[PDB]
Amino acid sequence: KNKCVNFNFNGLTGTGVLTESNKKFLPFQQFGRDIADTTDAVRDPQTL
């Protein structure tokens, strides 16, 4: 966390700084997207 890295989560991959936030996704919904239709957050595929 808190570093520039290339991450691969489940079937998604990308580069960016990963920081745990207070956002809460619905129970079964892992991947989000912003107003630009680009993922701004991802839920930990393993932990919650």
């Binding site: 912003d34 630009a36 680009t38 701004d40």
Partner: peptide, 28 residues
């Protein structure tokens, strides 16, 4: 007269701050 720039600033579009701040403009 009214994040939005948060998403767009990440796409590679950078919003440059104005050389003249709104605080000094009020003093004009």
């Amino acid at each position: 007269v009214t994040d939005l720039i948060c998403a767009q600033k990440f796409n590679g579009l950078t919003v440059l701050p104005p050389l003249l701040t709104d605080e000094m403009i009020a003093q004009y």
